[PDB]
Amino acid sequence: VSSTKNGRDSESKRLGAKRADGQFVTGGSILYRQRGTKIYPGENVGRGGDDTLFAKIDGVVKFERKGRDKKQVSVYAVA
């Protein structure tokens, strides 16, 4: 009479990028959902309590490099 003990699992949290690079977004729009500092915040970009990247100014997104092995997302007011 063989038994089991590995049929438990949690729900999946839709993580990853929510906005593409070069797309127009409005202030308050989420840009990234992660568990830690996978992507640092750039210009006009704040960090939430759950390490969520959001925009504060309406403009276009821009994913660039910060340092040598760290990425960062910023937003520019220029339409």
Partner 1 sequence: MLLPKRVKYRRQHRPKTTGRSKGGNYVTFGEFGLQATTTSWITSRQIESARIAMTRYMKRGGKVWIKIFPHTPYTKKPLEVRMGAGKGAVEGWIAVVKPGRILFEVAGVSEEVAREALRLASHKLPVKTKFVKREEL
Partner RNA sequence: CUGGGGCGGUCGCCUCCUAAAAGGUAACGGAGGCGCUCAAAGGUUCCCUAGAAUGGUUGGAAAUCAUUCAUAGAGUGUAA
Cross-strand pairs, 41: 73
Q: 52-55 and 39-41: which strand pairing?
A: unpaired
Write the interaction track for partner 1 spanning residues 3-22; mark x where CB under 8 A is met and - where it is not.
xx-x----------------
Q: Does 16 bind RNA (CB under 7 A)?
A: yes
Q: Does 7 bind RNA (CB under 7 A)?
A: yes
Q: Which two tokens stand for residue 38?
A: 């996978």
Residues 20-49 that bind RNA (CB under 7 A): none
Q: Does 2 bind partner 1 (CB under 8 A)?
A: yes
- Contacts with RNA, residue ranges (CB under 7 A): 1, 3-17
